[PDB]
Design a protein around this ligand. Sequence first.
Ligand code: MG
Ligand code: ZN
Lengths: 57, 119, 241, 49
Amino acid sequence: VRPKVLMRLSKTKKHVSRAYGGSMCAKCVRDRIKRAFLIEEQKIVVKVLKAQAQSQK
Amino acid sequence: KKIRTSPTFRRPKTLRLRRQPKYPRKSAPRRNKLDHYAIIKFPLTTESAMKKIEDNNTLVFIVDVKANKHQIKQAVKKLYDIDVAKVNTLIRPDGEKKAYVRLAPDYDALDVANKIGII
Amino acid sequence: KVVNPLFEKRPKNFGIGQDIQPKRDLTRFVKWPRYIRLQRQRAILYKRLKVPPAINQFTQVLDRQTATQLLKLAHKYRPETKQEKKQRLLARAEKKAAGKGDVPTKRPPVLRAGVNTVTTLVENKKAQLVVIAHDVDPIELVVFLPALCRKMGVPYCILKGKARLGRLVHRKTCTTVAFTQVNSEDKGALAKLVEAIRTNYNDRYDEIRRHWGGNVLGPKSVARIAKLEKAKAKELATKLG
Amino acid sequence: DPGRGAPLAKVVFRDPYRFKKRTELFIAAEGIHTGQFVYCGKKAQLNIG
RNA sequence: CGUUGCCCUCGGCCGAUCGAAAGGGAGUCGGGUUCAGAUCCCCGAAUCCGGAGUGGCGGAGAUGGGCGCCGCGAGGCGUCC
RNA sequence: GGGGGCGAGCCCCGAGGGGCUCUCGCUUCUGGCGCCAAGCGCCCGGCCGCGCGCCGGCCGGGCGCGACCCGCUCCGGGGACA
Ligand SMILES: [Mg+2]
Ligand SMILES: [Zn+2]
C-alpha cells in the first residue's frame, strides 16, 4: 500500500514476526545466520592455528 | 587539557540576550479596527438569503474581507447572543466576503432575523 | 569470593579494516578558521624568513629573575591612579583656608609612560633606565628606541609584555616605561639593576646590530636534511675510518 | 551511467572512523561481478578491480 | 509537574530562498435542492490529519508457580521466586 | 623519537638479556556483524557494619591508562617558475 498509508496500519501488517522481518526475505536471513556462524567459526579456527604457531616458535 | 576530537571547528555557541529595551518604540499599542462590529457589515435580505434563512437555519452576511471564519463565528456570537454551528465564506465578484452562517439547532433563524431587522 | 565469572575483557582492535578507530585527539589536523590559521603562519614567517637585526633585538628579552626585580622596583613608582588624584586635590583645597596653605608642597617622582614622553627624555638624558616592550604591535613605533637609547648612554632593556608593562601604569598596554628619578632609599637598587642591564644590552650593541635572526626551516625540512647528511656521512666515514 | 560506454560499479566500503557504510562509484574493470570484494591500498593484492 | 536561566553532554552534512492549478503529495462518497451554486447547500452514510494534561472508559501489559499452614471440600491467610 | 613485542637482518651477549636495522602498528575462502568501552588503576559524596577509619558492605559519582612522547607549517604535489 502507498507509503503514507503505513502511518495508519497496525505494526503487524507492516512487518513480519521474525528476525529482520519486513525488511529482508527469510531466504537471505537463513543465509546470513549460517554464514555469520560459518565465518566466525573459521576466525576461531585461525586464532587456534595462530596460538599453536606462537607456542611452537 | 581538553582535546579536539573531530577535525572541524564549528562556531562556538555563545550567550545571546533577550531585548531589555530602554523605551518602547510606538508609545501605546494599536487598537484593533476589526471588531465584533466592523467585521460584520450588514445582512443580506436578498431572495436567496431569505430562502436560506427560513430553510437552512442560517443567516447570510456581508463581512469585512479580512475576516476568517473564526472571526465571524465569534463576531456574530457576540453581537446577537447567538451560537453558530458553522460559518462558510465566499468572496463576491465585487469585493464582498459573503459569509453563510448556520445557527446551531436550538436557535431558530427566522426568529433571530426579525430580532436584527431584516425579513 | 569477590568474583563474578561473567566479567570478560572484550578488548577492541584498532587496526586497519578492524574495529573502527577511537576518537583520538586531532588538534594537529583541525581545519582552523582563517583568523587562527593566519596568526599562526605569521609566526612561521617570522621564524622562516630572514628577520633583520633591528627587529630581532626584541627577541633578546629580559630574563625572569631580572624582570621581576625590575617590576618589584617599578611598583614603588606606579603613577598616581584615579581617586588618589582627587584625594590629593581635596586635601589641598581644605588646607588653603583652615590652617596655612603653602600651595606647592613637594611633588614626588614617578614612572614615565608613552614613547613620545620617553623619547624626549632619551634625547634629553632625563632617564636613567628605559624599559621597552618586545611585542609592540606595529613595530615602527619602537625600533629606533634602542639605537637611540644606546647613543644617549641610557640603559635600556626589553621587557616581555607590553601589557604587563602597561599594568605598571593603569592602562591596557604601554610600549615604554622610563625612570627619571627615584627616592634615595630605593637608589642603590635601581643602580644594581641598571648596571646588569647595560652589561646585557648597551655594552654589546655592536653584536646585536650585526645579529640577524630568522632563516630556520620547518623542522620537517631540517629532519629530512639531517637524514641525508647521516646518509652522506655513512657513505664516507665508516668505510675509511 | 548514461553518456558512458563503461559501466560504473557501486562499491561499498565501511568508514573506519564513523560507524557508517560509505559508498563509491568506480569505473568497472571488465571481469567484475557483484558480491565481489574489492581490496585497495598499498597492501592490496594485485588482482583485477 | 510544568516553565524557563545557567552549567555540562551530544549533534556531520550541504546550503538562505524560489521553482509544477498535467510530476510527487493523507483524507468524501450516495441521494436530495436552485432562475443561476453544488464531491462545497440539506439529509445520510464515511473518512484523514492534528490535539487529548488532570489521563474519559474498557482491553493488552498480567496476574502464574512454589513451599508452609488452616479448612471435610470450594478455598483463606503466611512466606518465597 | 621512543616504547611493545610475534618475528626477520646485523651488532653485542654472561644464553638471562641488551643495542642498532627492518617490521607492524596486528584485517584476503564465504554478499555476515563491528560506533556510543570492556578490562585494569587511582580518587571522592552519601548510607550501613566493624569502630583506628582512605578496615568491610550498600548506593552514587570523578580522573588516568586502555587509544605512547615531542613538534612550526592539515595532507600531498608543484614552486620562485607558473
Ligand atoms: Mg516551492
Ligand atoms: Zn533475499
